[PDB]
Design a binder for this molecule. Structure first.
Ligand SMILES: COc1cccc2[nH]ccc12
Ligand SMILES: COc1cccc2[nH]ccc12
Length: 1104
């Protein structure tokens, strides 16, 4: 009945866990990072983190642990998903082919059980005898480790202690032994059990239970020679081991709860600890010797090292380097120094990694140009709180601009053999060449002895033996550097025109119609080595040297007229190594051999905007795994450039693009420029690390931004942003924020709300103090901060005009929060006017509850207050006055409107459709969803389709059912397990303003950004069929079924997804092998071809 398409615009960025070990090989040190559904694998080096392989799971990663059974040469990886998919994984590399293989898998869900409270815990014994899982209170699930247990069959042990806080397997025990903290009415306790595989039961543990701190929260199992356990609490750190017990209560940890630990030394001599304010501690275990040669713990000490991002996890990586994995802020690499600095920190940040999460609110604004949407998010929490401004495509920063029409090519040149930077830019035109010299930022015409100015240049550059080369339509000219003289000139035997040229430092290949000539550059000599006659006219050439080649190519890449071939030829023989026919009647225009992330590719652009690319074996010349993207509608010219120590390809067309690599796949990102015809890198004194760009009229020089799909600007607030709205008439944002103060109350640090240009107050981890920030849309400076009342929490924000009043106001809805109130019984609506650098209060209305949500509605103000939805009019006396009320809610948390229709999202009874009835001045309840759902966000897709997100990470779509009692039942016609928690939906697009209609973005807790759009039945059916066929050919990590992953799942209900296409799966079509493609298309509704589908999937990827 309803047809929706959901796709990832930004993958989750928050770090949910991190481990180290030897996964990729015995000798490698790896960091593995879990970002919800993604697993990232790195090799740790001296340079830092080298990415080797990233994969998606069809599940939320809940457990991730490396372990090494006997009879394994390197670590295996245990993953458990939130839907109880268990797997054992092995890394396997053969060639440039990397696979994660599933060694064992099965689902370990029980029929009876509600999830525990400190969540899923999975632990592995040091001796690899078993995996232990705490999934439900009162049960401990054991998976015997045994290479024959490939289905990961398990048994449950009754656990007497119902409320386990944390649990680990101990080192140095004769039988597998767990150590855990649990809570009963008599307080918190630490206890141990042995786990008997024979008996499938617990046995008495090696040491008796002890009482621990009331807030003991984490168990650390200390390796030999210490053995035993460390128990971290809020006020205390204790060690336990047999008839051995040691406790410290260091005041330095008491300010903030410690929430993560990491072992620095293999023998447990030192641990890192991180708290909720980003403090980083070293915990140091002092050894005591014994006559029998055992080692016992003499003492524990804690030292403050400094401050990091608020850490979800810490991993020491050797050589003083720590990876700080953050959920609430940016992740980091930090370095620990033996000696402190001028402020006393031992911690020095080396590198910062972008985390958008949590995205708690966002909005779309055409900040810079019309039709070019940017997303502005409220991101992070506490000291990590920020605005993030997200926009598609790569920017150029223009530093020079010269009027100079009709450029046909650009080449940079080093005219001085003693200087490393370019000093010369050579320009081609129809029938002509011009040379520009660069003196600082000055750019002047000039002649260059040796070069001719009265032929068109096809190539010029530095070549071997301190020489320059110019290849024109007439000849190849070889020029000495000092002085500039012609030292050798090559012409075709009858002086026919050169039609195509390619050149590296020591080799030249020129075409003359169908003929090819191969020259070598020697001292004062162009040496003709070989020639051939191609079957057809030559369209394009390349001899870019790849690999450990010494600047020499054994290969010549060629594109031909007529058969539209790309071929790899051997030099010097010109023997055909490999031929690919590209199809059509439109010739190749640009061909390039290139290397990305150490793999070799052949790129070939046609004049219609198509780019084909292939893997290239530089040994055999074999092309493989053809793929095709469309880069425009005009001839593309390809050119290599370096930025930030990486080689990329710039593609000039009507739509300039950078081609680059990410996770060993080619990626394409728009450059934010009008049409570019030609470019070259340029690295001169006055224009370091730059690009020269030409169109029909202009020559530009500038620098390029980071090569990435999305550009992110960060605005640190140093406090928690909560909501955002844009006020066009003021050219600013309003942002609700809260900061923590300690009980007067005292701030922990300066932040946006205490550092505004001007400030105002309302007149009447200890306390939240709430503020409305006014933020400039261009500088993101905090222009003004208005502070609310003590214990007043700001929940809702809108910028709008009301009634016949021409002013635009910021309107804020609040709650008065008191400790023993089940919910708030009091709050305000406050109308503010931003004028002359400050907020003035124009009006207030006290209400008897929390103002959760507000929306402008037809010149009126719609607000949700506890269990009520209310519409206010703005009177001539500038007051809000109730028009009508709706009462039939539990807790009305979310509103959206369209026309006279109102979608209401409830705490627990899903969604409800109201209509305002303009001839009766009241609401009519049209229909509601009688299926209970715990809502997190709502959106109206159109008059008949309503989108919900709920707390168990599902989407659904409701429609009207086409009695009166029947018409009042909304039908859930779409269901989809997204696997993210949606905080906000908002209509809009990051793509400059079709198989899809409409555009709704959403932001999530993990910093994932997604898009929802609508499909026709026809499109839905085709794509559903594609999914089903894709799911047969794709091998999933852990052998999870896609249909299982995407099934709607709450504690009440599991059902197959319906009415939803998984765009991430569809887009993965462009990454499968061609045998697989063919397989996917066999008999698919005329009979579709691979290439039809490749086209269809491209149209789809363009919507984000
Ligand atoms: C369930 O345990 C296994 C599965 C797969 C491979 C393994 N190697 C040693 C134990 C093991
Ligand atoms: C090491 O790489 C990361 C870790 C955490 C977040 C990240 N964002 C971009 C890269 C990245």
């Amino acid at each position: 009945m309803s047809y929706n398409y959901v796709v990832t615009a930004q993958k989750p960025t928050a770090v949910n866990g991190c481990v180290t070990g030897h996964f990729t090989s015995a000798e490698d040190l790896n960091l593995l990072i879990a970002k919800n559904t993604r697993l990232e694998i790195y090799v740790v080096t001296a340079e830092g983190l080298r990415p080797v392989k990233e994969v998606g799971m069809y599940g939320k990663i809940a457990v991730m642990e490396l372990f090494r059974p006997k009879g394994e040469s390197k670590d295996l990886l245990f993953i458990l998903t939130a839907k109880y998919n268990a797997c054992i994984l092995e890394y396997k590399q053969s060639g440039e082919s990397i696979d994660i293989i599933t060694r064992a898998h099965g689902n370990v869900q029980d029929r009876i059980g509600r999830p525990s409270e400190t969540g899923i815990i999975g632990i592995i014994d040091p001796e690899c005898r078993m995996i232990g899982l705490r999934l439900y209170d009162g049960l401990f699930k054991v998976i015997p480790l045994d290479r024959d247990n490939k289905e990961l069959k398990a048994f449950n042990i009754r656990l007497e202690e119902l409320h386990v806080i944390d649990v680990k397997f101990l080192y140095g025990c004769q039988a597998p032994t767990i150590c855990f903290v649990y809570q009963d009415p008599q307080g918190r306790h630490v206890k141990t059990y042995e786990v008997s595989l024979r008996e499938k039961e617990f046995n008495k543990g090696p040491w008796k239970q002890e009482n621990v701190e009331a807030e003991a929260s984490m168990v650390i199992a200390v390796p030999e020679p210490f053995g035993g356990a460390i128990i971290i609490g809020q006020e205390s750190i204790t060690y336990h081991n047999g008839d051995k017990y040691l406790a410290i209560a260091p005041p330095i940890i008491k300010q903030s709860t410690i929430v993560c630990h990491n072992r620095v030394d293999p023998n447990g001599s030192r641990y890192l600890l991180g708290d909720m304010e980003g403090r980083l501690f070293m915990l140091l275990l002092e050894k005591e010797e014994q006559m029998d040669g055992t080692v016992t713990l003499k003492d524990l000490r804690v030292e403050l090292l400094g401050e990091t991002s608020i850490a979800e996890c810490l991993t020491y990586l050797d050589n003083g380097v720590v990876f700080v994995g953050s959920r609430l802020g940016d992740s980091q690499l930090v370095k620990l120094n033996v000696d402190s600095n001028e402020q006393g920190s031992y911690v020095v940040a080396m590198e910062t990694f972008t985390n958008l999460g949590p995205i708690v609110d966002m909005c779309v604004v055409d900040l810079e140009r019309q039709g070019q949407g940017q997303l502005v998010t409220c991101s992070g929490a506490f000291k990590e709180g920020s605005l993030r401004i997200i926009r598609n495509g790569i920017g150029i920063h223009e530093h020079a601009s010269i009027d100079l029409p009709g450029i046909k090519g650009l080449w940079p040149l080093r005219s001085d053999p003693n200087r490393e930077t370019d000093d010369t830019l050579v320009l081609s035109f129809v029938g002509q060449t011009r040379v520009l010299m660069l003196n600082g930022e000055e750019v002047e015409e000039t002649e260059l002895m040796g070069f001719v100015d009265d032929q068109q240049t096809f190539f010029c550059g530095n070549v071997a033996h301190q020489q320059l080369i110019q290849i024109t339509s007439a000849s190849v000219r070889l020029v000495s550097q000092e002085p500039k003289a012609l030292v050798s000139e090559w012409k075709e035997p009858q002086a026919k025109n050169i039609s195509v040229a390619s050149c590296n430092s020591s080799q030249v290949v020129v075409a003359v119609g169908r003929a090819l000539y191969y020259l070598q550059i020697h001292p004062q000599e162009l040496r003709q080595i070989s020639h051939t006659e191609m079957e057809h006219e030559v369209a394009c050439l390349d001899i870019t040297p790849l690999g450990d080649s010494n600047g020499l190519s054994p290969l010549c890449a060629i594109g031909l007229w007529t058969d539209i071939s790309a071929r790899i030829l051997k030099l010097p023989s010109f023997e055909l190594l490999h031929k690919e026919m590209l199809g059509g009647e439109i010739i190749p225009r640009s061909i390039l051999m290139t290397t990305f992330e150490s793999s070799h590719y052949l790129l070939c652009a046609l004049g219609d905007g198509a780019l084909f690319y292939f893997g290239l074996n530089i040994e055999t010349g074999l092309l493989s795994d053809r793929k095709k993207v469309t880069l425009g509608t005009q001839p593309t010219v390809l050119r290599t450039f370096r930025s930030l120590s990486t080689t990329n390809v710039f593609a000039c067309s009507d739509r300039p693009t950078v081609i680059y690599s990410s996770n060993h796949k080619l990626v394409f990102s728009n450059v934010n420029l009008k049409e570019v015809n030609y470019m070259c890198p340029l690295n001169s004194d006055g224009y370091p690390d730059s690009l020269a760009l030409a169109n029909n009229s202009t020559l530009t020089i500038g620098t390029i931004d980071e090569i990435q799909k999305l550009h992110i600007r960060t605005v640190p607030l140093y406090e928690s942003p909560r909501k955002i709205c844009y006020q066009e008439v003021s050219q600013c944002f309003g942002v609700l924020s809260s900061r923590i103060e300690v009980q007067g109350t005292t701030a922990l640090r300066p932040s946006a709300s205490t550092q505004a240009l001007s400030s105002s107050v309302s007149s009447s981890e200890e306390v939240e103090v709430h503020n409305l920030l006014i933020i400039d849309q261009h500088t993101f400076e905090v222009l003004h901060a208005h502070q609310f009342l003590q214990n007043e929490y700001a929940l809702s924000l809108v910028s709008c005009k009301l009634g016949k009043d021409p002013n635009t106001y910021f309107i804020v809805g609040t709650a008065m929060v008191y400790p023993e109130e089940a919910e708030p019984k009091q709050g305000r609506i406050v109308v503010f006017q931003y004028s002359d650098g400050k907020l003035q209060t124009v009006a207030e209305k006290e209400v008897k509850g929390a103002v959760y949500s507000m929306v402008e509605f037809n010149g009126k103000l719609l607000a949700s207050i506890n269990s009520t939805v209310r519409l206010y009019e703005w009177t001539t006396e500038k007051e809000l006055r109730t028009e009508c009320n709706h009462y039939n809610n539990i807790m009305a948390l979310y509103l959206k409107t369209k026309g006279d229709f109102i979608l209401v999202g409830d705490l627990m009874r899903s969604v409800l459709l109201l209509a305002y009835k303009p001839m009766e001045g009241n609401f009519e309840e049209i229909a509601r969803d009688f299926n209970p759902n715990w809502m997190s966000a709502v959106e109206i897709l159109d008059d008949d389709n309503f989108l919900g997100a709920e707390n168990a990470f599902n989407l659904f779509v409701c429609q009207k059912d086409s009695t009166d009692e029947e018409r009042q039942h909304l039908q859930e016609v779409g269901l989809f397990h997204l696997g993210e928690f949606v905080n906000v939906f908002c209509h809009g697009s990051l793509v400059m303003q079709t198989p899809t209609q409409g555009s709704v973005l959403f932001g999530t807790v993990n910093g994932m950004i997604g898009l929802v759009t609508s499909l026709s039945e026809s499109w839905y059916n085709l794509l559903l069929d594609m999914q089903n066929r894709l799911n047969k050919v794709i091998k999933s990590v852990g052998k999870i079924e896609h249909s299982f992953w995407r099934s709607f799942h709450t504690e009440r209900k599991t059902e197959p997804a319906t009415g939803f296409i998984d765009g991430d799966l569809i887009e993965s079509f462009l990454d499968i092998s061609r045998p697989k493609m063919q397989e996917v298309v066999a008999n698919l509704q005329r009979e579709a071809t691979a290439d039809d589908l490749i086209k269809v999937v491209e149209e789809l990827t363009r919507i984000h």
